[PDB]
C-alpha cells in the first residue's frame, strides 16, 4: 500500500493531453486568473476613477485601446487585496479602484513561476537538460523588473505599465520623454539581443532550408524527413563554406550554434532588465555632462543628442497634465515649450 | 541619420508625424522581432537540451560534435517529447524541415511588414487615429490611452526642428 | 603529495576571438558614458 | 569637451584586464602538448 503522496504524484504526472504535474497546481489557477482578469477588465471595466480614461469594450474602446489600467497614484504600492482596507470586500469598488491591476500582476508573477517550474518538471520527467527553463529566466527578469521593481521604486503602481496595447505604447513614450531610455546602454544591449536573436532565427532557419540534402523526389521537400533518422537533414559542410565565403566567418560546431541562439536573446533581455532597475530609482542615462557644458556656453553647438532632449522636454510638458492627473498640473499656454509656428 | 542618437531622433519624429506605434505593420514588425528572439531562444534551448552525451563532466559538450559528422548531434524525438508536453503534443514540430522553415519565415515576414510600414508611411498613410473617438452622452470627450499617446506625440511635434517651420501645418 | 583535483584549462582560438569582440564592443559602448 | 578625467583609465582598464585574461588562457592552451 503506497501512500497518498505517491498516489497523488502518480496521477499528477500521468501522460495526458495537457500535462498537469505538481507545478500545474500553481501554474493553471494563476495563469487562468491572470488571463481571465485581463479579458474581463478590457471587456467590462473602466479607468475613470484611477486615470480619467475609458478603457473597455463596454465603454467604446477597441482592441488597440482597451487596457486594465494601474491603480490611482494615491493607492501607493498597496496590494489592493479585494478584502483589503481599500476595497473592504466590495467587488465593484475594487474594480473601480484598480484592484484588477494588482490581481493580474500578482497572479501573473506566480503563474510565470509555475510555468518555469513546469519546464523544470517536464524536463526532469523526460530526461533532458533544463536549458529551456534557464532561457525562460529572461522573460521572468523582464516581467519582474518592469511590472514590479520599477513601480516599487517610483511613487506607486500608477506608473507601472497598464495592461493594454495603447497603454504599453504610452509607457514607451513616457520612458523616452522622462528617462531618455533610448540613451541607456543597458537598453541598447537589450535591443542588440532582440534584433540579433531575430537575425539568428531567420538566418539559421534559412540556412538549414537551403542546404537540405535531396532525401525524396517531391518538389515540396518537407516530407523527406523522418524524426527518428540518424543523418543530418542538411549539409553543415556546405553551409559552413557558403557563409565563410559570403560573410567571412561561419559556424562549424552545431552545438555551439544552438547554445549561441539561447545565449544572445536571453542575455539581451537580462541586460534590459538591469537598466529598468536603474530607472526604478530615476538612475537614468539621461545626459552627457560634457555635452551640456559645451552647449550651455556655446549657443552654436548642436548635436543629435541635444536635439532629442528638446523632444523629451516637449513630451514632458505636453503629456504630463493628462498623464499624471493626480498632480493637478495647470500649464498656461505661454509656458509650453514650442518651436516656431507649430 | 548615420548615427546612434540620430537614429533615435528619426524614430521620435516619425512617431510624432505618423503615430507609427499605432500602425499595424509596425506592430507586425514587433511581433516579428520579439517572436524571432523568442523562437531563437526556444530553438537554441531545445536542441541544447537534447544533446547526446559524448563528453565527460570536465569537457565542454561542444566537443561532442565534430564538424561534418554524418549523424545528428541531438535527439529531436527527446526535444519534441519535452516541448509537446510543455504546451500540448500537436503544438510542437517533429519535422526539422517544417521547424526550420518556420524559424526563417516568422522574423522575415514580420520585418517585411516593418519595412512596408516605413515605406507606406513614407506616403503619409499613418497609424490608427482614435483621438477623441470616445464621447459621452452630452458630447464630452472621454479620453483613452490613445489620447495620452496623442499628448506625447504633440510634445514631439511642436519641439522638433524648432526653427524650421513658418506656417501652421507640418505638411512634410 | 600532489592534489588530484587539478585540471588543465583551455581557451581555443575562436573563443579568444569571441571574447575579444565582446570586450572591445562593450568598451566601445560604455566608453562614452565613462567620459560623460 | 570637458569629459570625466577618470574616463580614460576606466576605459583602458576595462579593455586591457579582461583582454589580457583571455590572451593568457589562449596562449597557454596553444603551448600544451599536442
Amino acid at each position: 500500500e503506497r501512500g497518498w503522496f505517491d498516489i497523488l504524484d502518480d496521477w499528477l504526472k500521468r501522460d495526458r493531453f495537457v500535462f498537469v504535474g505538481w507545478s500545474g497546481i500553481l501554474l493553471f489557477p494563476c495563469a487562468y486568473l491572470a488571463l481571465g482578469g485581463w479579458l474581463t477588465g478590457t471587456t467590462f471595466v473602466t479607468s475613470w476613477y484611477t486615470h480619467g480614461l475609458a478603457s473597455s469594450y463596454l465603454e467604446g474602446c477597441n482592441f488597440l485601446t482597451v487596457a486594465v489600467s494601474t491603480p490611482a497614484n494615491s493607492m501607493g504600492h498597496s496590494l489592493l487585496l479585494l478584502w483589503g482596507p481599500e476595497a473592504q470586500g466590495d467587488f465593484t469598488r475594487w474594480c473601480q479602484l484598480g484592484g484588477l491591476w494588482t490581481f493580474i500582476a500578482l497572479h501573473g508573477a506566480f503563474g510565470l513561476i509555475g510555468f518555469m517550474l513546469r519546464q523544470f518538471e517536464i524536463a526532469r520527467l523526460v530526461g533532458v537538460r533544463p536549458y529551456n527553463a534557464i532561457a525562460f529566466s529572461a522573460p521572468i527578469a523582464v516581467f519582474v523588473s518592469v511590472f514590479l521593481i520599477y513601480p516599487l521604486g517610483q511613487s506607486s503602481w500608477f506608473f507601472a505599465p497598464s495592461f493594454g496595447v495603447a497603454a504599453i505604447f504610452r509607457f514607451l513614450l513616457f520612458f523616452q520623454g522622462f528617462h531618455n531610455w533610448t540613451l541607456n546602454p543597458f537598453h541598447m544591449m537589450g535591443v542588440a539581443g532582440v534584433l540579433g536573436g531575430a537575425l539568428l532565427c531567420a538566418i539559421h532557419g534559412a540556412t538549414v532550408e537551403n542546404t537540405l540534402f535531396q532525401d525524396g523526389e517531391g518538389a515540396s521537400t518537407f516530407r523527406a524527413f523522418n524524426p527518428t533518422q540518424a543523418e543530418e537533414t542538411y549539409s553543415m559542410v556546405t553551409a559552413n563554406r557558403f557563409w565563410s565565403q559570403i560573410f567571412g566567418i561561419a559556424f562549424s560546431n552545431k552545438r555551439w550554434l544552438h547554445f549561441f541562439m539561447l545565449f544572445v536573446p536571453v542575455t539581451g533581455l537580462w541586460m534590459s532588465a538591469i537598466g529598468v532597475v536603474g530607472l526604478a530609482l530615476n538612475l537614468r542615462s539621461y545626459d552627457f555632462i560634457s555635452q551640456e557644458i559645451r552647449a550651455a556656453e556655446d549657443p552654436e553647438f548642436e548635436t543629435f543628442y541635444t536635439k532629442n532632449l528638446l523632444l523629451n522636454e516637449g513630451i514632458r510638458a505636453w503629456m504630463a497634465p493628462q498623464d499624471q492627473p493626480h498632480e493637478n498640473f495647470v500649464f498656461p499656454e505661454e509656458v509650453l515649450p514650442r518651436g516656431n509656428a507649430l | 541619420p548615420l548615427g546612434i542618437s540620430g537614429t533615435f531622433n528619426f524614430m521620435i519624429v516619425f512617431q510624432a508625424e505618423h503615430n507609427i506605434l499605432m500602425h499595424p505593420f509596425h506592430q507586425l514588425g514587433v511581433a516579428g522581432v520579439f517572436g524571432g528572439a523568442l523562437f531563437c531562444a526556444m530553438h537554441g534551448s531545445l536542441v541544447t537540451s537534447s544533446l547526446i552525451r559524448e563528453t565527460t563532466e570536465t569537457e565542454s559538450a561542444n566537443y561532442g560534435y565534430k564538424f561534418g559528422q554524418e549523424e545528428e548531434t541531438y535527439n529531436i524525438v527527446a526535444a519534441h517529447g519535452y516541448f509537446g508536453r510543455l504546451i500540448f503534443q500537436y503544438a510542437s514540430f517533429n519535422n526539422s524541415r517544417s521547424l526550420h522553415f518556420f524559424l526563417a519565415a516568422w522574423p522575415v515576414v514580420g520585418v517585411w511588414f516593418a519595412a512596408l510600414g516605413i515605406s507606406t508611411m513614407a506616403f503619409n498613410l499613418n497609424g490608427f487615429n482614435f483621438n477623441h473617438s470616445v464621447i459621452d452622452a452630452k458630447g464630452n470627450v472621454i479620453n483613452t490611452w490613445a489620447d495620452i499617446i496623442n499628448r506625447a506625440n504633440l510634445g514631439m511635434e511642436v519641439m522638433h526642428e524648432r526653427n524650421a517651420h513658418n506656417f501652421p501645418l507640418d505638411l512634410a | 603529495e600532489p592534489n588530484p583535483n587539478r585540471q588543465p584549462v583551455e581557451l581555443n582560438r575562436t573563443s579568444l576571438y569571441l571574447g575579444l569582440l565582446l570586450i572591445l564592443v562593450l568598451a566601445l559602448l560604455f566608453s562614452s558614458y565613462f567620459f560623460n | 569637451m570637458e569629459v570625466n578625467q577618470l574616463g580614460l583609465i576606466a576605459t583602458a582598464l576595462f579593455v586591457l584586464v579582461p583582454s589580457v585574461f583571455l590572451i593568457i588562457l589562449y596562449v597557454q592552451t596553444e603551448s600544451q602538448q599536442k
Binding site: - | - | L24, A27 | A12
Partner: peptide
C-alpha cells in the same frame, strides 16, 4: 583624448575582424 580612445577601440575591432577571418582556426572534417 576621448576621440583617440574611440578611434583606437574601433581600430582594434577592425584588426580583430581581419584575424578572425584570415587567421581563423580552419574548419576540418575528421
Amino acid at each position: 583624448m576621448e576621440t583617440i580612445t574611440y578611434v583606437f577601440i574601433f581600430a582594434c575591432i577592425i584588426a580583430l575582424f581581419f584575424f578572425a577571418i584570415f587567421f581563423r582556426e580552419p574548419p576540418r572534417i575528421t
